[PDB]
Design an enzyme around this catalytic site. Sequence first.
Site, PDB file in Angstrom:
ATOM      1  N   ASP A  99      -7.938  -4.304   7.705  1.00  0.00           N
ATOM      2  CA  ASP A  99      -7.179  -3.391   7.624  1.00  0.00           C
ATOM      3  C   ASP A  99      -6.589  -3.239   9.324  1.00  0.00           C
ATOM      4  O   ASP A  99      -6.245  -2.004   9.478  1.00  0.00           O
ATOM      5  CB  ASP A  99      -7.587  -2.032   7.045  1.00  0.00           C
ATOM      6  CG  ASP A  99      -6.460  -1.126   6.760  1.00  0.00           C
ATOM      7  OD1 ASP A  99      -6.724   0.383   6.857  1.00  0.00           O
ATOM      8  OD2 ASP A  99      -5.507  -1.566   6.646  1.00  0.00           O
ATOM      9  N   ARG A 106     -21.699  17.259  -7.451  1.00  0.00           N
ATOM     10  CA  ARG A 106     -20.737  17.756  -8.889  1.00  0.00           C
ATOM     11  C   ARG A 106     -19.385  17.014  -8.660  1.00  0.00           C
ATOM     12  O   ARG A 106     -18.618  16.870  -9.761  1.00  0.00           O
ATOM     13  CB  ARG A 106     -20.616  19.103  -8.680  1.00  0.00           C
ATOM     14  CG  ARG A 106     -21.667  20.009  -9.219  1.00  0.00           C
ATOM     15  CD  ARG A 106     -21.336  21.221 -10.292  1.00  0.00           C
ATOM     16  NE  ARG A 106     -20.992  22.301  -8.845  1.00  0.00           N
ATOM     17  CZ  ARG A 106     -22.191  23.000  -8.345  1.00  0.00           C
ATOM     18  NH1 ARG A 106     -23.450  22.367  -8.521  1.00  0.00           N
ATOM     19  NH2 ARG A 106     -22.260  24.014  -7.677  1.00  0.00           N
ATOM     20  N   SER A 110      -5.366   6.383  15.959  1.00  0.00           N
ATOM     21  CA  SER A 110      -6.726   5.548  15.793  1.00  0.00           C
ATOM     22  C   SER A 110      -6.189   4.009  15.393  1.00  0.00           C
ATOM     23  O   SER A 110      -5.767   3.494  16.243  1.00  0.00           O
ATOM     24  CB  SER A 110      -7.546   6.164  14.958  1.00  0.00           C
ATOM     25  OG  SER A 110      -8.334   7.373  15.362  1.00  0.00           O
ATOM     26  N   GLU A 126       0.822  -1.338   0.003  1.00  0.00           N
ATOM     27  CA  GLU A 126       0.020  -0.054   0.094  1.00  0.00           C
ATOM     28  C   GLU A 126       0.895   1.237   0.014  1.00  0.00           C
ATOM     29  O   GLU A 126       1.207   1.684   1.026  1.00  0.00           O
ATOM     30  CB  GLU A 126      -0.909   0.115   1.262  1.00  0.00           C
ATOM     31  CG  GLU A 126      -1.938   1.358   1.255  1.00  0.00           C
ATOM     32  CD  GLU A 126      -2.499   1.253   2.247  1.00  0.00           C
ATOM     33  OE1 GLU A 126      -3.928   1.306   2.358  1.00  0.00           O
ATOM     34  OE2 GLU A 126      -2.167   1.489   3.458  1.00  0.00           O
TER      35      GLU A 126
END
Lengths: 382, 356
Positions: free
Chosen positions: B273, B227, B281, B131
Amino acid sequence: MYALTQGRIFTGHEFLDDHAVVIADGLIKSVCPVAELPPEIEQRSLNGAILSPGFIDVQLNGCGGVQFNDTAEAVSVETLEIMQKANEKSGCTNYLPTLITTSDELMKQGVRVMREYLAKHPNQALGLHLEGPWLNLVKKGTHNPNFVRKPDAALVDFLCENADVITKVTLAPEMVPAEVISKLANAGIVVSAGHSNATLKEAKAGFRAGITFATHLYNAMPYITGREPGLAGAILDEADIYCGIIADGLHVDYANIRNAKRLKGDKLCLVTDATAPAGANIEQFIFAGKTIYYRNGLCVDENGTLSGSSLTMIEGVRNLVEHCGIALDEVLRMATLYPARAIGVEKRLGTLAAGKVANLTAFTPDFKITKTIVNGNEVVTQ
Amino acid sequence: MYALTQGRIFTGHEFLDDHAVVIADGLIKSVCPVAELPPEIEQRSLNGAILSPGFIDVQLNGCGGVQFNDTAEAVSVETLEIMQKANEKSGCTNYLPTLITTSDELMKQGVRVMREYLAKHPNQALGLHLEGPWLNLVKKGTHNPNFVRKPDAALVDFLCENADVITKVTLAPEMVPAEVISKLANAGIVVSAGHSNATLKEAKAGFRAGITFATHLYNAMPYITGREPGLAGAILDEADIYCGIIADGLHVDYANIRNAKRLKGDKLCLVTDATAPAGASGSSLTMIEGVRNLVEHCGIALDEVLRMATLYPARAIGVEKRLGTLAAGKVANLTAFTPDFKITKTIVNGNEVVTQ
Ligand SMILES: [Zn+2]
Ligand SMILES: [Zn+2]
């Protein structure tokens, strides 16, 4: 009496070929195969066009060059008359003139005018759609920040007392006491969540108090984060909430619309949320004390801020069809049956059936309006 | 050989109530009605538990007190072994050790270590999940900005050359040339979009170049706006794109998971994960916990939830020919749990490594 024939007919539930729609006394008498018609009945050909119930736009600020907003001079019966004739050229036979956050004075004037209009033009502009002023400053959009304010008990009661000409009110759930919502709701008014920065919890609290609709999904709402779905995330996960979506390809990216249709099913309604330039030819218009230039088919102010829509229901229908992968029949429902059931007028307007009001529209395969009928009378012929 | 009996058997495609699974030579020999079992085979009672293919976690940085990151001492075969045993306790038999953006050197060590682990341990830690480091600083999350960088021919080629021990690479599509994506993908590596601030248009370009997966949907991605759909909106609207989602009720609100599952269908994968604390955290989710959460809070049927933890991840990384389902010939990696989601048994290569 007469009957429409020779063309695909969409009742709102299915497509019928070699069939006819018999209209008489401003209502639809029946739908039947062209074969069951007495040879002497006046037959009007569709010339191979698709016949559908008239389009119903539940959020429209203006069109035909005018706007039912801002000034006391604009908020009038003629504006509604001009707006109606403009919509008709776009296959839209019914709508909700939408008055955005302004003074109690202009609000009260709107109510009187709507009531006045209703006493002259039936089955057309159905009723008022009050967007604001109990909104969240952070998601005020183009609204005049000076009029965005907390709900006054007396004003609330006023609305309930005049529910007979007020179809819907858009408010920010996190900016209003639950009682207000319950009050308006019990009065028979459709309460919709919009121009809000409500969290998921606040949104759900808004629904339990009586909100059953959401105004222009994704617009004037919190962005969606993994941890905080926000109001938009909440609307998507709530099966029974109806909501409008502007399909001009500018306000909402088409991928967002496809995502919304998959999650909302039969609860997603097409709306234009249009303004003056729609169905007209103007350079600019004023609103909330600001100049909105209609530059390059876009409504933008001097800062480059997208400040309005110029979409028409046929265009919305066309766009949903070719850019969002939604079949024509389901798209037609998004412009008729769904919004009709969302505002509670499906008893007489969302479909082509016996007893229903004769409000229809016909268009060709390339989405060009050929006919618009209001109370049985053909008002548009192209 | 032996047979697993007396319990609900979930094959990946359906539940079976009065059947059994015969295991022999580390493989699933057959699945059959208990009354068809050869009378000689030893029968082992599931005691009413639910039997399922072993969970496959395609994104895990650490667990069981260790992490496959940071230090040269941590990126080791031992850490991978420790992580495997810790995963087995929560019903997870396969995983992709995830090495987050760091130096080229540490990346090369990771690759070496993965290969050495592979030659010693089959059908367990499947391959490397790199990653980073080609991420977007705007969405680097906890990633070291000093290591976040652009791809250079040398690194790209090294990864392609070692495709066989590198299962997946997470990168920010808008931060690398389309040719880099295609190079990795053609080498057989699963290219995944993540820690990206990609617009819907940039995301789509990434998919066309070869991206087929998305890392932890909603996290370290642009927030969705009318948008600006961003990478997340694109993934939701792209039917062929697989993606992992963390189901701890903390990284992603359950409402977003529900909206996600409805739009993703069979492409949504459960991942933890997780980090060091998971085992003993950041995330501390275990696969069995994610399964419970998905079933009790997201309104997803148990069988579909079980697929999100086995069949789908398996197909996402191309190992479905030997894992992801309980069928003849497939590798014998399974786990069993009581209706209240407590692991009772975990099996790897036919061996019961967990008994509770
Ligand atoms: Zn608005
Ligand atoms: Zn990450």
